[PDB]
RNA sequence: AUCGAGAGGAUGC
């Protein structure tokens, strides 16, 4: 299990990883010092003696060059010592183990690998500084932020080995994934929180930038587009030029909630050909969603075109935003005084509502719902009455947040964050839970020794009344501490169960592969499915289409 | 004169507060950058070490010594050590210096940059003098020593520029504001009630004019006037920083002009 | 500033990390499973100080 | 350890010119010059003055990667007027505004006290 | 550990100004506040180069040989 | 050839609903040339969507279920990873059994 | 990283020039990205910053102690009196360009800790090295100019990709591979290889 | 250092939880990640 | 003089403790909306009071400013990372001779301190510099 | 319980229906009741559904569950995959669990099951049974450092 | 046994696995100064050359596709369509 | 090359629809009673308010890099203050005897409603819009 | 070199 099914192996490397907004999707920053070490065995041939003899001469120490040259007899000429090292006449059907160069294929993975996608061929850019660099949007399917995760790289040794990476494993060909019959690489962070900021109706670029951004895009036809605004001053819309990014015959339709061909909320999305017509560009459009641009552009134009598309959007968005700025102050969690009265007067009517149910339960009026403890339908009654107080006070602070709010704005792009995060940060944190019950009695009939026995109310059983801004209290702290802990606990062993499952899951279907009769079988040749997935179709290409023979009136049908 | 209109209000040995009327913003900037980055200077850049029983390690002090403010007045006639035809250094490219001290007393012996000592021929140019702005008269504080600790050193200071290391930089903080009321609306101020009872009025809001509620947006207007202020470390005095900035900017613009001729 | 509490052995600073055990000499009752012949067991870990 | 010696920010290497000039294949009367060992303090000035010139259709620069000291300036001009001139006339136009700057300052500095 | 020369963030020499700091506090009895301002530290990164810095050197000095 | 007819059936029901005579002409006014293509297109466009003889679907399906399993962590039923565990074990000792009469 | 589990690597280094900067002339030492803020919800980070600024100015200690009567409000009212806008924003100017920044930016002093784990102590690569003795496989750890384990779990994704020729070389050409003889009859390794 | 001198092993029903009675004695927050998480405490 | 008792978790089981010695037991006779919301006095039997709640913490979290304003597992991370933070690990590092030691060129005591940093001797052997930080979606690196 | 269902007129509409949920399971006898629809009733035990309604009804039940796991979280895995897995168990006639007991004791080359759980003993009783091992499974060919009849390795190549 | 010139089900198209391997298999031959069957209009990468040899249907190889029972099918790389 | 529609419109509703540099505007047609217009206008570039009246054009006229001005010395189809250039997406049939075209000036939108524009407001890519006075 | 323990990094949002 540790030496045949998985071997230690040569021709490989590993460093830390860092995000490079100026790399093509399918590329990989190899630290020079690594590129100086790994070696492809290349053959002597009329096509190459020239680039090659050069490299042999170049030496195993300045960059493009080689250690070792290999002969007729098959003996090892060692290019870091050897008397005839600034010499050597390369003689056809010999081998020059050169360094790794730009545009080579490489298998680049991240543990733990739970995908075909956690192993992808990348192109090579030899660079300065010793971090392995990659384009943000090759993030999701490796699952690596830059907080300090390491990453692995392997280098092929036969020509065919190359092919096999560059035709099957190569990143672009992964962009829309079997698993979920949708894409898996997206528009992430800044670019996301930017490609919205850029897009708002109010966002007008003027000439100076407009020209640069144009330049900035690498495939730009050199034909400036006519400005939306021509009046007192010639301006362009955000949408206006982003559009330059988008190729041709790319069509796209949405409609959100209030979306009426005019979308007076800039709702939905309409993309006619290389251009954009109305509505904000955000996650639903530009993230690795289903109906979205990436899923389109791939099936439409190619992997390659889409692959490129990534770079294009960023190279621009990055730029626009680079000059615009963005941030988050604590003032982005503050909210109105007259709301900070409503939030508290919304808690204090839920607290005084638990108090009555509590007082009623104690007068044995509280009716037992069918099939459950009298206590059980107090425990449930309260939790519901406290979660409600939160979402309520929470949402009461989503309504107070202005449009100029940064936090509120990332959420709008869906760059990071959600509701809860606001409610937590600005209004009230919530009920703590351990094995899904509000804080237990560890001490006899109480929670802390600062409490009296037989106290069931929210302040005593783990309700954190306060926000993160206002500040937790001693008890509150200690409770929330109790909870959060549980988080850490399982993640150190929810994963150990998960990881057993997978190994089994994998070890059991392993060798099931469609055969050349389209039947689906194992090594015994026993059918499992007579056609793959009940229709002999590969998952990738498939997408969600409405069968509108189904709904509608018998009437509306005939019409 | 003809165009770019400078005007000082307050000025000193280290501060030049000045409007800079009638320019492109694009420029004003490039001026400030080239100011911080590309104006050559002298500072230590090679430490030969005889003895050091300090509580500090060798390569620390060597670092400390780098930063020390040395006279770059006549600097623009000292020759780049990369250029000058001599094997390592010479007095045509370098001012060599010496530091020794030695614990003499019980009570902690300091080691100031006044204790620095030129050795090589100055050919009579004004260069390489450890600058002291200190009132007491002891520039910087290299290191400290107890009863029996030596320190023997050999500084070879060479021409260089901030782009190569912030030692060779001859500035620090460069104050920079334009259009103090947002008349150009280049910014979008963030608020909870009155944008103007929430942010502060910058000292620069007197020279210029208020907006007056009734007036609409002035769109076609651009960037004039740049409320700058240059502080100085003081290898080069304030006036020469701005002077030589303008200068080196112009100088390197020009190398392109020459490059185009040479093709 | 060194505050001690360690040891020295072969020349390396060594710390004893306090171990933790459930206390001896204490009565506890312990409800027990459904496919067990035993409903309730009471345990006492008895050892001499 | 992989780090690239500072001085490769302002010193030209080998077989490298302070300019390579190339014709844009897309438009006509269009050109993208390279600027070795340079950056914003220099690109940004060139362009924006290159935009005061009324006989220039297009002008822009781009730092392709901050790892390196380059920046590419693409310039498109009216029929006839070869861009090298637009670069030229503008290059000079700055030297001038700079020449006055120096002097005008020079004048004012001399007048203060302290 | 020996007062830095020149704050990382502004660049303004801050070495020379350790000693003076001490006196202006502990002699003519000022608060660190107005004490940092007499020394010409208006900007606060360079304000923080001095108020924070912790002069451990004093300690390493204590050790004999 | 019967397993063939069966295997398309669903896809065709669409096909026919979207290539309905009233539609083709009334809703998105095609042409002969344009149609001939729309057709010639689908044929090829389809043919590309078949599973390739080679595809190692054992692993695929495992992984494809394994991953989102790992994405699990935290109204009373055995759900999340443990339920998954109970499912693959063929669990005779199941925690929440339930009928759901209609 | 910092002190609020807001750990991070240096992605790039910028010179004081290209950096954004305040109108007083302050550059910032480091820049974090306002995305690592709403999901890990660390708000104290935000506070300490605000408090610090006040402390840099007033030349006082910032009382960051847990359960205390100290408000964001409380700090602001102070930071207001002190010449800046009460919640830690400062109008900043992009540095490539000079053009003022369309949005205000949060900006303060904020205790940041350099952690162990530098890149250069990890950056390990091998292209054939020494073997173990028992297996004839490459040796563990980088400390011996090691070999990287193509782990079982990895192999599965090479089966997954359907790239077999790659999977054979990664487990043969490099890693092991050995030449032994076998008997046409008794199908074992009894065959005495009397070569030559 | 100060921390490593105050550490608590526990070898091997619910023993990694932070439990009511820990208030004032064990540190509710300090504790190591993954491997033996929650078992080890600091005073 | 008996003003303090040592209390263990077993005995803990039988007492009634108060958090703030002040506000938590004078009279019962206007209110800053900025301050958090503290529960009540609702006990009348109080045997003991707490020294300072801050003290429920240990050595590594005592280095966290405003932990009472943080989401919880976050407090733990910093707790785990204080231990890999670099600085003055002992004054006598020059003399001692152990495999591996790192010290900061110019460490600093933080700008925001804990009342508890005081007895942990942090202000005096700190690990970390008070660097000027800017939260901002710059370039994009 | 909610329900979308056909009005005569054509449209689907909202016809809500009372539904009974349970703790514990004896289907053998709740379906035989009056007042209830014994085409529609559902027990989340798919192991019971297997016994009562036959091996093929059990297929879907397993699935419907495996599915309700995946999408209770909010995820979505395309049918083919879980379908594959569902079938995988349900073809050896009964429910064949994903653990050494079930899947890993059925025919298949020894070298193979060797790579799972009961490593040695597999080989042991496989040496005494005088097993023959095909050499058609992934694991088998990895062990011998050969090109595995897998994608790229499915076919031979000739001239 | 065999399987006849006609009577063929085997997706007539090219399985990516087939192709990748075919490209590979020439990409090998090419890179070992073996003769070339197209005009290298400027490329000299052996893999990039095989991609040309395919795009012009001049690769003298037959796929041998293996059916689960032990039979099999031959297809020259002329016969197969190459969509993808 | 020529004009494609003209009219004089009456401002009835100005909508700061949570914006600062754009308004959605509701204008009505003087003369014809079977007409109205919904339109996006940069209120910072050209102010509009309650009870205003603005002349409105189309034209498809006075596609290679939009050169800058140099048009202090050229032809300019503008006596008009305010002028945009977009693309038409849909033409909508609502009963009658009537008709309505939708316009997108890079996101800034327009709805126009009538009938005589049947042979005029073509569905091409070109379509300027000029407001004055 | 080999066997043994322990600390730590990545997923914890
Ligand atoms: Mg990570
Ligand atoms: Zn010299
Ligand atoms: Zn400063
Ligand atoms: Zn034999």
Which domains occur in chain B, in start order?
Answer: 1-40+167-263 (3.30.1360.10), 41-166 (2.170.120.12)
Tell if G40 CB is < 7 Å from nucleic strand M.
yes
For chain L, what are the domain ranges? 1-133
For chain K, what are the domain ranges? 1-84
Q: How far is B92 from chain E (nearest CA, A)?
A: 28
Tell if G149 CB is < 7 Å from nucleic strand M.
no
Cβ A329 vs Cβ A469: under 8 Å: no
Give the orientation angle of helix G44-58 with respect to helix G72-81, to 10 degrees: 30
Tokens coding J67: 């599915």
CB of H13 less than 8 A from some CB of C: no
Cβ within 8 Å, pair A334-B192 = yes
Taking the stretch 1-43 of protein chain H, residues with Cβ within 7 Å of any atom in nucleic acid chain M are 32-37, 40
- The parent domain of residue E51 ranges over 1-65
User: What gap in Å lies between CA A213 and CA L86, rounded to an integer?
Assistant: 20
Cβ within 8 Å, pair G16-E11 = yes
Tokens coding B133: 């702005």
According to CATH, what is the number of the domain L1-133?
A: 2.40.50.140
According to CATH, what is the number of the domain G131-196?
A: 3.90.1800.10
What is the DSSP-derived secondary structure letter of residue E53? B
**Does an H or E element contain E50, and which?**
helix E45-52
User: What gap in Å lies between CA A129 and CA A460, rounded to an integer?
Assistant: 55
Task: Report whether the peptide linkage leading into residue I110 is cis, meaning its omega lies within 30 degrees of zero.
Answer: no
Is G183 annotated among the ligand-binding residues?
A: yes
Cβ within 8 Å, pair D54-L67 = no
Fold of K1-84: Eukaryotic RPB6 RNA polymerase subunit (3.90.940)
Nearest CA to L28 among L46, L8, L43, L48? L8
Cβ D81 vs Cβ D32: under 8 Å: no
User: What gap in Å lies between CA I11 and CA I7, rounded to an integer?
Assistant: 6
DSSP symbols for B13-70: SSEEEEEEES--HHHHHHHHHHHHTT--EEEEEEEEES---SSS-HHHHHHHHHHS--
CB-nearest to I34 from G7, G11, G73 is G73
CB-nearest to G83 from B32, B190, B200 is B200
* C1' of M11 to CA of A400 (Å): 35
Which of G152, G155, G158, G160 to probe the F interface (max F CBs under 10 A)? G160
- For A510, residues 6+ apart whose C-beta sits below 8 A from its C-beta are F58, F59, F62, G159, J137, J138, J139
Looking at the DSSP bridge assignments, the partners of residue L105 are L108
User: What gap in Å lies between CA J27 and CA J44, rounded to an integer?
Assistant: 11
Taking the stretch 116-145 of protein chain G, residues with Cβ within 7 Å of any atom in nucleic acid chain M are 117, 132-133, 139, 144
Phi–psi pair at J94, nearest 5 degrees: -115, -175
Closest chain K residue to A105, measured at CA: K47
Tokens coding J139: 């694991």
User: What gap in Å lies between CA G170 and CA A6, rounded to an integer?
Assistant: 10
Closest chain I residue to C3, measured at CA: I90
Cβ E50 vs Cβ E14: under 8 Å: yes
* Sign of the torsion angle spanned by Cα atoms G173, G174, G179, G185: negative
Taking the stretch 11-70 of protein chain I, residues with Cβ within 7 Å of any atom in nucleic acid chain M are none
Tell if A499 CB is < 7 Å from nucleic strand M.
no
- Taking CB atoms within 8 Å and a gap of at least 24, the contacts of L118-126 are L120/L4, L120/L5, L120/L58, L121/L4, L121/L5, L121/L58, L121/L88, L121/L91, L122/L4, L122/L60, L123/L88, L123/L91, L124/L60, L124/L88, L125/L87, L126/L60, L126/L61, L126/L63, L126/L85
Cβ within 8 Å, pair I105-B55 = no
Residues of chain D whose beta carbon is less than 8 angstroms from a beta carbon of chain G are 1, 39-41, 44, 63, 66
Residue A98's alpha-carbon distances to A43, B59, G71, G126, G166, in angstroms, are 10, 38, 63, 14, 20
Tokens coding L35: 């007409």
Which of residues 113 through 152 in chain J touch K, CB cutoff 8 A?
149, 151-152
Domains observed in chain D: 1-114 (3.30.1360.10)
Tokens coding E1: 């550990």
Query: How many structural domains does chain E have?
Result: 1
User: What gap in Å lies between CA I72 and CA G42, rounded to an integer?
Assistant: 9
Nearest CA to B11 among D111, J51, A425, G190? D111
- CATH assignment of the domain containing E15: 1.10.10.60
G5: left (phi > 0), else alpha (psi -120 to 50), else beta?
A: left
Neighbouring C-beta atoms of residue D16, cutoff 10 Å: 11
Cβ J82 vs Cβ J66: under 8 Å: yes
Is G157 annotated among the ligand-binding residues?
A: no
Residue I114's alpha-carbon distances to B229, D68, I110, J49, L44, in angstroms, are 39, 44, 10, 63, 51
User: What gap in Å lies between CA L123 and CA A275, rounded to an integer?
Assistant: 16
Taking the stretch 70-129 of protein chain I, residues with Cβ within 7 Å of any atom in nucleic acid chain M are 73, 80-81, 83-84
* Sign of the torsion angle spanned by Cα atoms A158, A159, A164, A170: positive
Closest chain G residue to I65, measured at CA: G64
Cβ A303 vs Cβ G11: under 8 Å: no
Nearest CA to A308 among A210, A178, A219? A219
Torsion, Cα F57 F62 F68 F73, to 10 degrees, reads 180
- Burial of J155 (C-beta count, 10 Å sphere; 0-12/13-18/19+): buried
Nucleic acid strand M: bases within 7 A of protein CB? 1-2, 7-13
Which of A198, A199, A204 to probe the L interface (max L CBs under 10 A)? A204
What is the DSSP-derived secondary structure letter of residue A552? S
Pairs across B and D, CB distance < 8 A:
121
* C1' of M2 to CA of C13 (Å): 27
Looking at the DSSP bridge assignments, the partners of residue G148 are A9
User: What gap in Å lies between CA L84 and CA L104, rounded to an integer?
Assistant: 10
- For A275, residues 6+ apart whose C-beta sits below 8 A from its C-beta are A243, A246, L87
Cβ within 8 Å, pair D92-B13 = no
């Amino acid at each position: 299990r540790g030496n045949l099914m998985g071997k230690r192996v040569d021709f490989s490397a590993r460093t830390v990883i860092s995000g490079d907004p100026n790399l093509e999707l399918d590329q990989v920053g190899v630290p020079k010092s690594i590129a100086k070490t790994l070696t492809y065995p290349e053959v002597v041939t009329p096509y190459n003696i020239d680039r090659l003899t050069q490299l042999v001469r170049n030496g195993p120490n300045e960059h493009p060059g080689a250690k070792y040259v290999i002969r007729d007899s098959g003996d090892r000429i060692d290019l870091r010592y050897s008397k005839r090292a600034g010499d050597i006449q390369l003689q056809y059907g010999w081998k020059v183990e050169r360094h790794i160069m730009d545009n080579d294929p490489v298998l680049f993975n991240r543990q733990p690998s739970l995908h075909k996608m956690s192993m992808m061929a990348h192109r090579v850019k030899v660079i300065p500084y010793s971090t392995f660099r990659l384009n943000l949007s090759v993030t999701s399917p490796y699952n690596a932020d830059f907080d300090g995760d390491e990453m692995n790289l392997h280098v092929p040794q036969s020509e065919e080995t190359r092919a096999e990476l560059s035709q099957l494993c190569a990143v672009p060909l992964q962009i829309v994934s079997p698993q979920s019959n949708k894409p898996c690489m997206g528009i992430v962070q800044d670019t996301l929180c930017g490609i919205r900021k850029l897009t708002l109706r109010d966002t007008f670029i003027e000439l100076d930038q407009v020209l640069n951004m144009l330049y900035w895009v690498p495939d730009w036809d050199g034909v400036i587009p006519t400005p939306a605004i021509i009046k007192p001053k010639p301006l362009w819309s955000g949408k206006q030029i982003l559009s330059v990014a988008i190729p041709n015959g790319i069509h796209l339709q949405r409609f959100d909630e209030g979306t009426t061909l005019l979308s007076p909320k800039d709702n939905g999305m309409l993309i006619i050909d290389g251009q954009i017509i109305f509505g904000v560009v955000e996650k639903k459009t530009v993230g690795s969603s289903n109906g979205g641009l990436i899923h389109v552009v791939t099936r439409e134009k190619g992997p390659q075109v889409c692959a490129k598309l990534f770079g294009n959007i960023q190279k621009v968005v990055n730029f626009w935003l680079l000059h615009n700025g963005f941030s988050t102050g604590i003032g982005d969690t503050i909210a109105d005084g007259p709301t900070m009265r409503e939030i508290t007067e919304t808690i204090a009517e839920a607290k005084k509502k638990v108090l009555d149910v509590t007082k009623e339960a104690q007068a044995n009026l509280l009716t037992a719902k069918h099939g459950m403890t009298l206590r059980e339908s107090f425990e449930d009654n309260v939790v519901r009455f406290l979660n409600e107080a939160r979402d309520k006070a929470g949402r009461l602070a989503e309504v107070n947040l202005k449009d100029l709010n940064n936090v509120k704005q990332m959420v709008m792009a869906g760059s990071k964050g959600s509701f809860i995060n606001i409610a937590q940060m600005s209004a009230c944190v919530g009920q703590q839970s351990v094995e899904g019950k509000r804080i237990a009695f560890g001490f006899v009939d109480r929670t802390l020794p600062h409490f009296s026995k037989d106290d069931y109310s929210p302040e005593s059983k783990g309700f954190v009344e306060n926000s993160y801004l206002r500040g937790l209290t001693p008890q509150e702290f200690f409770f929330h501490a109790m909870g959060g802990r549980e988080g850490l606990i399982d993640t150190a062993v929810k994963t150990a169960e998960t990881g057993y499952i997978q190994r089994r899951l994998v070890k059991a279907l392993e060798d099931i592969m469609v055969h050349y009769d389209n039947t689906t079988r194992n090594s015994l040749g026993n059918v499992i499915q007579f056609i793959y997935g009940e229709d002999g179709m590969d998952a990738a290409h498939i997408e969600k289409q409405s069968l509108d023979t189904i709904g509608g009136s018998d009437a509306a049908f005939e019409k | 004169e003809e165009g770019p209109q400078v005007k000082i209000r307050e000025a000193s040995k280290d501060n030049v507060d000045f409007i800079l009327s009638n320019v492109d913003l694009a420029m004003a900037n490039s001026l400030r950058r080239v100011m911080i980055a590309e104006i050559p200077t002298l500072a230590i850049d090679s430490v030969e070490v005889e003895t050091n029983t300090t509580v500090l390690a060798d390569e620390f002090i060597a670092h400390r010594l780098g930063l020390i403010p040395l006279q770059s007045m006549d600097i623009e006639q000292l020759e780049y050590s990369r250029d000058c035809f001599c094997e390592d250094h010479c007095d045509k490219c370098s001012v060599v210096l010496t530091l020794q001290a030695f614990g003499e007393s019980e009570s902690t012996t300091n080691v100031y940059s006044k204790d620095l000592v030129i050795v090589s021929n100055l050919m009579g140019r004004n260069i390489g003098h450890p600058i002291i702005q200190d009132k007491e008269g002891n520039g910087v504080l290299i290191c400290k020593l107890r009863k029996g600790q030596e320190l023997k050193l050999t500084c070879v200071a060479k021409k260089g520029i901030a782009k190569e290391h912030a030692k060779w930089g001859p500035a620090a903080a460069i104050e920079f504001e334009y259009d103090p009321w947002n008349k150009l609306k280049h910014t979008d101020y963030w608020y909870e009630q009155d944008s103007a009872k929430e942010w502060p009025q910058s000292k620069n809001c007197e020279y210029e004019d208020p907006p007056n509620e009734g007036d609409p947006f002035d769109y076609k207007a651009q960037a004039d006037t740049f409320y700058m202020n240059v502080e100085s470390v003081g290898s080069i005095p304030v006036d020469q920083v701005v002077v030589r900035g303008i200068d080196t900017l112009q100088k390197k613009v020009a190398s392109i002009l020459l490059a185009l001729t040479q093709m | 500033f060194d505050m001690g509490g360690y040891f020295i052995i072969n020349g390396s600073e060594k710390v004893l990390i306090a171990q933790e055990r459930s206390a001896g000499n204490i009565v506890q009752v312990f409800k027990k499973a459904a496919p067990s012949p035993i409903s309730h067991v009471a345990e006492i870990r008895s050892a001499l100080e | 350890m992989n780090a690239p010696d500072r001085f490769e920010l302002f010193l030209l290497g080998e077989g490298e010119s302070k300019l390579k000039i190339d014709p844009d294949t897309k438009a006509p009367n269009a050109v993208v010059i390279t600027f070795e060992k340079e950056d914003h303090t220099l690109g940004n000035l060139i362009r924006a003055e290159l935009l005061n010139d009324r006989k220039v259709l297009f002008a822009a620069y781009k730092v392709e990667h901050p790892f390196f000291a380059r920046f590419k300036l693409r310039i498109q001009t009216t029929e006839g007027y070869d861009p090298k001139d637009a670069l030229k006339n503008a290059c000079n136009s700055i030297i001038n505004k700079l020449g006055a700057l120096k002097t005008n300052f020079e004048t004012e500095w001399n007048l203060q006290t302290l | 550990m020996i007062v830095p020369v020149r704050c990382f963030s502004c660049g303004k020499v801050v070495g020379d100004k350790w000693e003076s700091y001490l006196n202006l506090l502990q002699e003519d009895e000022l608060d660190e506040g107005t004490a940092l301002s007499r020394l010409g530290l208006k900007r606060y990164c360079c304000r923080r180069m001095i108020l924070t810095h912790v002069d451990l050197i004093e300690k390493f000095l204590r050790y004999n040989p | 050839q019967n397993a063939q007819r069966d295997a398309v059936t669903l896809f065709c029901c669409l096909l026919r609903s979207r290539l309905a005579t009233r539609r083709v002409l009334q809703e998105y006014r095609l042409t002969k040339q344009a149609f001939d293509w729309v057709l010639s297109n689908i044929e090829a466009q389809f043919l590309r969507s078949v599973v390739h003889p080679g595809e190692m679907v054992g692993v695929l399906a495992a992984q494809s279920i394994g991953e989102p399993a790992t994405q699990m962590t935290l109204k009373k039923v055995t759900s999340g990873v443990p339920r998954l565990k109970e499912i693959l074990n063929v669990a005779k000792n199941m925690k929440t059994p339930s009928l759901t009469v209609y | 990283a910092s002190r609020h589990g807001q750990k991070g690597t240096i992605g790039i280094t910028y010179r004081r020039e290209d950096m954004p900067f305040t109108a007083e002339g302050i550059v910032p030492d480091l820049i974090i990205n306002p995305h690592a803020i709403p999901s890990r919800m660390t708000v104290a980070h935000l506070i300490e910053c605000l408090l610090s600024k006040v402390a840099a100015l007033s030349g006082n200690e910032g009382d960051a102690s847990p359960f205390t009567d100290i408000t964001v409000e409380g700090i602001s009212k102070l930071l207001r009196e002190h010449g800046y806008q009460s919640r830690g924003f400062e109008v900043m100017y992009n540095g490539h360009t000079g053009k003022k920044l369309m949005a205000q930016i949060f900006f303060g002093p904020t205790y940041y800790q350099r952690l162990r784990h530098m890149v250069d102590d990890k950056i390990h690569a091998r292209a054939r090295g020494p073997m173990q003795v028992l297996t004839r496989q490459p040796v563990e750890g980088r400390s011996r100019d090691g070999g990287l384990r193509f782990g079982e779990m990895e192999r599965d994704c090479m089966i997954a990709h359907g790239a077999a020729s790659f999977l054979k070389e990664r487990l043969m050409e490099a890693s092991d591979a050995f030449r032994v003889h076998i008997c046409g009859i008794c199908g074992l390794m009894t065959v005495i290889a009397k070569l030559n | 250092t100060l921390s490593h001198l105050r550490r608590t092993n526990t070898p091997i029903a619910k023993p990694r939880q932070l439990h009511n009675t820990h208030w004032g004695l064990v540190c509710p927050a300090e504790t190591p990640e993954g491997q033996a998480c929650g078992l080890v405490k600091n005073l | 003089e008996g003003l303090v008792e040592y209390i263990d978790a077993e005995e803990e089981e039988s007492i009634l403790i108060a958090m703030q010695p002040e506000d938590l037991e004078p009279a019962e006779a206007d209110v800053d909306p900025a301050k958090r919301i503290r529960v009540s006095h609702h006990a009348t039997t109080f045997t003991h009071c707490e020294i300072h709640p801050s003290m429920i913490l240990g050595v590594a979290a005592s280095i966290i400013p405003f932990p009472d304003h943080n989401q919880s597992p976050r407090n733990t991370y910093q707790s785990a990372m204080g231990k890999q933070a670099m600085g003055v690990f002992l004054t006598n590092y020059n003399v001692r001779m152990d495999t591996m030691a790192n010290i900061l060129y110019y460490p600093q005591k933080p700008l925001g301190t804990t009342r508890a940093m005081e007895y942990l001797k942090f202000r005096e052997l700190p690990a970390g510099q008070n660097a000027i930080v800017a939260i901002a979606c710059y370039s994009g690196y | 319980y909610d329900r979308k269902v056909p009005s005569p007129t054509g449209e689907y509409v909202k016809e809500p229906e009372w539904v009974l949920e349970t703790d514990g399971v004896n289907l053998s006898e709740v379906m035989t009741v009056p007042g209830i629809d014994p085409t529609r009733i559902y027990t989340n035990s798919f192991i019971d559904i297997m016994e009562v309604l036959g091996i093929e009804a059990g297929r879907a039940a397993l699935y419907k569950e495996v599915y309700n796991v995946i999408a209770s979280d909010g995820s979505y895995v395309n049918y083919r995959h879980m379908a594959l897995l569902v079938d995988v168990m349900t073809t050896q006639g009964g429910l064949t669990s994903v653990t050494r007991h079930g899947f890993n004791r059925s025919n298949t080359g020894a070298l193979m099951r060797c790579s799972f759980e009961e490593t040695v003993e597999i080989l042991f009783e496989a040496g005494a049974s005088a097993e023959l091992d095909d050499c058609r499974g992934v694991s088998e060919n990895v062990i011998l450092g050969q090109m595995a009849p897998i994608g790229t390795g499915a076919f031979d190549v000739m001239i | 046994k065999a399987i006849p010139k006609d009577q063929r089900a085997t997706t007539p198209y090219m399985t990516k696995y087939e192709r990748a391997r075919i490209l590979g298999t020439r990409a090998l031959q090419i890179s070992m100064n073996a003769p070339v069957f197209v005009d290298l209009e400027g490329e000299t990468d052996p893999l990039r050359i095989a991609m040309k040899e395919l795009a012009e249907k001049k690769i003298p190889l037959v796929i041998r596709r293996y059916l689960p029972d032990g039979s099999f099918e031959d297809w020259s790389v002329e016969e197969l369509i190459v969509d993808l | 090359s020529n004009t494609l529609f003209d009219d004089i419109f009456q401002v009835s509703e100005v909508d700061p629809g949570r914006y600062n540099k754009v308004c959605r505007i509701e204008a009505a047609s003087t003369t014809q009673d079977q007409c109205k217009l919904t339109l996006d206008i940069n209120v910072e570039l050209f102010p509009v308010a309650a009870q205003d009246s603005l002349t409105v054009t189309i034209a498809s006229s006075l596609t290679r890099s939009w050169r800058p001005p140099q048009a202090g010395d050229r032809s300019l189809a503008d006596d008009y203050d305010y002028v945009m250039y977009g693309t038409a997406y849909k033409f909508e049939e609502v009963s009658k005897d009537l008709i309505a075209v939708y316009y997108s000036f890079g996101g800034l939108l327009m709805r126009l409603e009538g009938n005589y524009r049947n042979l005029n407001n073509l569905k091409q890519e070109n379509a300027y819009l000029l407001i004055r006075r």
